[PDB]
Amino acid sequence: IGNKTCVFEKENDPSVMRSPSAGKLIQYIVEDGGHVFAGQCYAEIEVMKMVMTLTAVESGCIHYVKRPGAALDPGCVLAKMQLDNPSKVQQAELHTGSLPRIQSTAL
Amino acid sequence: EIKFRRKDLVKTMRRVDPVYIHLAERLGTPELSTAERKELENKLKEREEFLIPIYHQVAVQFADLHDTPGRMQEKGVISDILDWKTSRTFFYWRLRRLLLEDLVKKK
Numbered sequence: 001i002g003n004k005t006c007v008f009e010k011e012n013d014p015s016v017m018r019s020p021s022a023g024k025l026i027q028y029i030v031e032d033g034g035h036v037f038a039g040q041c042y043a044e045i046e047v048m049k050m051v052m053t054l055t056a057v058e059s060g061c062i063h064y065v066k067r068p069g070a071a072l073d074p075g076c077v078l079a080k081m082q083l084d085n086p087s088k089v090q091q092a093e094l095h096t097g098s099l100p101r102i103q104s105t106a107l
Numbered sequence: 108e109i110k111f112r113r114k115d116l117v118k119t120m121r122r123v124d125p126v127y128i129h130l131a132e133r134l135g136t137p138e139l140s141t142a143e144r145k146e147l148e149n150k151l152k153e154r155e156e157f158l159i160p161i162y163h164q165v166a167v168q169f170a171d172l173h174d175t176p177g178r179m180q181e182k183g184v185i186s187d188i189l190d191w192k193t194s195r196t197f198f199y200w201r202l203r204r205l206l207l208e209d210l211v212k213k214k
Contacts, residue, residue, distance in 0.1 A: 067160040 013088040015058055017079040019072040023047025027068050028079075036062045042079065045072055058083055111166045117155055120162055127154050 019025075026044045036042050036056045043054040056062070060081040072078070120127050133139075134147040179185045189197055 069160060069164065 013091060015081050015083050016077055019076050019078050021047050021074050023072045025066055025070040025072055028064055032064050116162050120155060120158055124158060
């Protein structure tokens with residue numbers, strides 16, 4: 001803004017596994033409650049009549065939200081993973097106020 | 108998707124799931140209290156929604172029992188039910204029979 005800089009964080013912190021696309025869930029690869037490592041496939045979904053797996057981002061204990069056989073939407077909640085919470089805990093405190101409103105340009 | 112939509116699935120759950128049965132029977136008691144009825148209704152909603160995917164798999168299994176070769180054999184749309192491992196022998200002797208029958212029938 002002008003000659004000043006402000007940096008906003010894009011939320012990716014809750015460590016919730018999400019479907020990248022629409023489609024259908026066929027099955028899960030690992031046990032509910034089992035530990036998964038980053039890069040390991042944890043789920044099998046099909047969109048396009050063409051099967052695409054799903055790799056975990058973080059290493060932790062996975063618990064599944066959707067049961068095997070389910071409709072998937074992009075960005076939906078598929079499976080949560082428990083991690084050791086290095087940081088970024090409770091970075092919400094959702095602002096509930098009102099933005100500045102002095103002018104109006106209504107003539 | 109045509110004959111066993113959600114409404115009928117819920118009707119099925121009404122007579123199967125012990126938890127949903129217990130809650131449904133408890134809510135049937137006249138004049139318990141306002142608060143208790145509200146709690147029971149929310150419990151019923153959560154339980155019936157939670158049980159949809161499993162009873163959906165049950166439903167398609169039920170429908171699958173209608174598509175078996177036993178039914179086709181009773182209705183007379185197939186000739187017989189065969190085993191794979193011995194199909195070679197069966198079809199050999201059958202085709203031999205049919206060819207000889209064709210010869211005599213042409214005569």
